[PDB]
Symmetry: C3
């Protein structure tokens, strides 16, 4: 048969899973307690910001909270993450509902991932960051939010730097291969907040710059899919 805990399935190697009543021995390890022991999972081999985007859309639409967001070091491999998102809810169907949203939206966002032989580029955008990016990055709540990275890390710098030069945006996260923000990926990651117009202007210049460099390197970077802004 088909196990009730299964849900689907999206790009990268992503699954949606639901656990109705998590064994109490695991409660300590996830955010859980007895009034709240049902779990929604988004887990994937390839990517992380894309799935995070989809999951952030999900919590905005449901009665869920964020138990844990962790990043291997997969991707498959290298040069990026790795995604493991656990949402918690008092009621399984709330969790299931959220997982259903996140799965639906994943492939949409993977459209923002440009792959190629020597690495990748990824630029994500949201107009209201919520619980996901608040927990992952300390994104200013409710504000527009941007996520940047490229591999190898050098390309990531060019991206990161031109993003910040381009417009008036706050630098929320700087992540390098080994500064402890990233799971030893060959990336420079930047996280950005501000007015939508400003954030979008930065993201776009950054995407442009990234592709430019990757091409200069003899690469043919291609989404994925297709982008969202």
């Amino acid at each position: 048969p088909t196990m009730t805990e299964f849900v689907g399935t999206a790009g990268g190697d992503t699954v949606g899973l639901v656990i109705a009543n998590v064994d109490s021995l695991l409660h300590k390890h996830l955010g859980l307690d007895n009034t709240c022991r049902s779990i929604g999972i988004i887990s994937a081999r390839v990517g992380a910001p894309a799935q995070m985007m989809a999951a952030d859309e999900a919590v905005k639409g449901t009665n869920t909270e964020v138990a844990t967001i962790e990043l291997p070091r997969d991707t498959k491999g290298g040069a990026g993450h790795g995604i493991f998102i656990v949402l918690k809810a008092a009621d399984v169907s709330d969790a299931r509902r959220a997982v259903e949203i996140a799965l639906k939206q994943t492939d949409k966002y993977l459209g923002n991932v440009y792959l190629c032989d020597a690495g990748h580029l990824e630029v994500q955008y949201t107009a209201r960051a919520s619980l996901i990016f608040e927990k992952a990055f300390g994104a200013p709540s409710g504000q527009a939010f941007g996520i940047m990275h490229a591999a190898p890390a050098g390309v990531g710098m060019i991206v990161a730097d031109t993003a910040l030069k381009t417009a008036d945006v706050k630098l929320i996260t700087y992540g390098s291969p080994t500064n402890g923000v990233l799971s030893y990926t060959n990336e420079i990651l930047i996280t950005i907040s501000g007015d939508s117009g400003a954030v979008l202007q930065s993201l776009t210049a950054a995407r442009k710059a990234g592709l430019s460099i990757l091409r200069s390197m003899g690469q043919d970077p291609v989404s994925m899919s297709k982008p969202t802004f």
Copy 2:
């Protein structure tokens, strides 16, 4: 010729090595001292619990001790570890003898690894955990012991949770991609102790559940080899 330090060779990319008299500059870094400076090594590209199982069998049969157990982040890659086991002995032949056992038993245990495109499943069992699992996991000594994980991590949860639900077992280790127990693998790992009957019942349900989910994901998971319980 064939270097005297060589020993073989087993599945994954595993070697058995022996060093007769480790240079004293390395003593500080391994557990070593002058009354005890001979080394037995099990090193592999793919897997870790399997080799650990084989090495635990080895120390039970020899006059050896555990210098170090470390896990890359290989596998090759991803989504798992990575194994590096160093056994110490006063006498090289004791170390060699242990390495010989561990190599013989490795492929047997790899039979418990089910591979496939989107990840893997692995369930291991022992009836007397000894020095290896005591050092690696703090396994209750002499007691039956179980090891679980699956990639991507989500599958690992389902496995982990149904194992604990199934029978009356102690939770010894909870490992996620980034909680510091695992080397940024895309896995959830669980470690279990209790009565053999209980442990075996958990392991089997967990294995069943894992395969179920992997299949629901359109995967065809296959050991390896063939399983041991």
Copy 3:
């Protein structure tokens, strides 16, 4: 067009990049300040000591300093690093000049990398270690310097140990998969200093031993390129 920040391109997947005036929001994160905000980058998917060798040659020849040296966990993958080197300069052309040197020299050094299916061997040498290896390893400044590793880690031990046995050299760095010196690679790394004659004698025996073992494992290890000593 071709972005002014681009430079080339060498083996592994290495790029040379230059940023003229790094955005001040990133200054805190790199070593930077306002009298010194231009950046030279060497970033690659495969290897690290080779590029480090090339970059150390570069700082010896230019008015540059080391902002950051970080190692993913790439390579591609596994079983090694991963390289990300940032040099800082008051003047962009000094940085560019350094990047130009490092790119020219990279492939030369990759000649010291022997690849094969189950892992790799790498032995590097310099007669004056400078700023790179001082920052990365705390190499005794101005002295001859050696770098060793092999994957899987076991081979690394044999290499490391016979190097130290062979001649009168200082042990500067011991790195294992998980002791925190390496980014969870399946390697044992050793770093060595002393008189050139001594260092070269160690490096060569170590290289010999490594290849010996890899071959015993049924591997056909081949540089890369071709070696430098």
